[PDB]
Task: inverse folding
């Protein structure tokens, strides 16, 4: 049977989570407010069912039992994030450290390590303290960099003796696009012509924010390398998400469109991280709306990772979009490309419970080989991979998830192929550990290998996928 022995010795298999999506205790334990507390409460129409992460999975209180479930599955690693406003309630270091917040993360880490599970810790998973958003507009401002650095340093100082894998941030594409182009994610900003957000500019702010995300990342990495890595002996990277782009047709127009789509989503980050420069297509199409790295900034950002985390979910077909005389100016329309999961009406792969998301396991290897070939064979972790069910069956039926067993079998086979093609993948994390608060989708989508019965006291039930993973892991 297909099992972990097919993967390199010491390969890390894990499951993933994040703080706002799992913890709850949003106003407890000394925690201060973050932009997702604010967003979910002030824009309920932007979350399915007007849900919040006020309680989520209550991982804050239930972590001891959840860590037992991780051990039961037999996982090697666990991805989790630090809630910035839980440890620094006013965002700034001078605003004071919340000892009870530090204590929570220490408790989780110590329990994880006692079970032989390596913590892979994301420093920033979108839950910016409201205090920083209010003071200077969060990642719209160059001021964010040094507050981010202090936050990262707090983490290194308090946890780095035990944590040996750091991720500066998760999916800065999602933060920038979702938060500042489409206004679908906190802090919920977009152009006035969209009649969807009170403030913003979809044609400028995504580029401003991405620049500052990259600079904040780079500052944290520099600090880790110079002050902590030699003694703590850990590794630091960053997690990027991209869809794999397939040309809608064999035309040059569609081939080019597919690459532009990949440039704007993926290259936007990985080309600065690899080359110290933005993609040529973005320089060309976005022009002076796209910030330039100074010589010093380029040197700081280029090479600023020990490993690359990749989140992979889907592939899309891409169509060329001709220029117009009608300027709905936005990051989204800048790429002159249109993504669709359908060619001639037929989906790109097996359906899932999520309408836009189809199964395309080939695209994981395709992405990995592309990354190897373009960005100098980096060390890679698959930091997220998974699928969602719709939340409208019973607990007993929700636990039976052969479609997710299928999903993981196919993607791990594809991952095995990528490794055999020479891609330096060192680990793999399922999104998600638990069914959780899936941002704008609230609790309508279930990505977990463990079922959470939100209607019955948040009870945990391992799904068939979790039991399959347990068998796969020889545990
Ligand atoms: C796991 O896979 C290997 C192939 O690499 C096989 O030799 C071994 O018997 C398998 N173990 C199981 C299925 O328990």
Result:
């Amino acid at each position: 049977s297909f099992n972990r022995t097919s993967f390199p010795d010491g390969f890390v298999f894990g499951a993933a989570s994040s703080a706002y999506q799992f913890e709850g205790a949003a106003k407890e334990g000394g925690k201060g407010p973050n932009i997702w507390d604010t967003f979910t409460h002030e824009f309920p129409g932007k979350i399915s069912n007007g849900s919040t992460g006020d309680v989520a999975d209550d991982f804050y209180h239930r972590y001891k039992e959840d860590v037992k479930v991780l051990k039961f599955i037999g996982l090697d690693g666990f991805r989790m994030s630090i809630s910035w406003a839980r440890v620094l309630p006013r965002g700034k270091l001078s605003g004071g450290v919340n000892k009870e917040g530090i204590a929570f993360y220490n408790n989780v880490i110590n329990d994880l390590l006692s079970k032989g599970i390596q913590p892979f810790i994301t420093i920033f998973h979108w839950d910016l303290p409201q205090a920083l958003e209010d003071e200077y507009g969060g990642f719209l401002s160059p001021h964010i960099v040094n507050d981010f650095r202090d936050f990262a340093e707090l983490c290194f100082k308090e946890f780095g003796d035990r944590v040996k894998h750091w991720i500066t941030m998760n999916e800065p594409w999602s933060y920038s696009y979702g938060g500042y182009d489409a206004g679908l994610l906190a802090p919920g900003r977009c152009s006035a012509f969209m009649a969807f957000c009170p403030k913003g500019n979809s044609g400028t702010e995504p580029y401003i924010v991405t620049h500052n995300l990259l600079l904040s990342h780079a500052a944290a990495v520099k600090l880790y390398k110079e002050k902590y890595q030699a003694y703590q002996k850990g590794q630091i990277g960053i997690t990027l998400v991209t869809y794999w782009m397939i040309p809608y047709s064999n035309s040059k127009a569609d081939k080019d469109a597919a690459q532009r789509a990949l440039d704007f989503m993926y290259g936007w980050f990985i080309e600065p991280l690899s080359f110290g420069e933005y993609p040529k297509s973005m320089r060309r199409l976005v022009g002076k709306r796209l910030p330039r790295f100074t010589k010093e900034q380029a040197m700081l950002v280029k090479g600023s990772f020990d490993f690359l985390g990749l989140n992979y979910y889907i592939a899309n077909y891409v169509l060329n979009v001709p220029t117009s005389n009608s300027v709905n100016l936005s990051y989204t329309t800048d790429s002159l490309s249109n993504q669709t999961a359908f060619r001639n009406g037929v989906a790109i792969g097996r359906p899932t419970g999520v309408p836009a998301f189809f199964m395309y396991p080939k695209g994981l290897k395709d992405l990995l080989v592309y990354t190897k070939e373009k960005y100098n064979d980096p060390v890679i972790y698959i930091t997220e991979n998974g699928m969602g069910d719709n939340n409208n069956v019973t607990t007993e039926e929700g636990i039976k998830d052969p479609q997710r067993v299928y999903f993981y079998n196919q993607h791990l086979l594809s991952l095995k192929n990528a490794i055999a093609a020479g891609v330096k993948v060192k680990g793999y994390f399922t999104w998600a550990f638990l069914d959780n608060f899936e941002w704008l989708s609230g609790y309508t989508q279930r990505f977990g290998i463990v079922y959470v019965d939100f209607k019955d006291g948040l009870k945990r039930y391992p799904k068939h996928s979790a039991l399959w993973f347990k068998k796969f892991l020889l545990k």
User: Anything to note?
Assistant: The chain has one domain: 1-475. DSSP finds 17 helices and 19 strands in the chain.
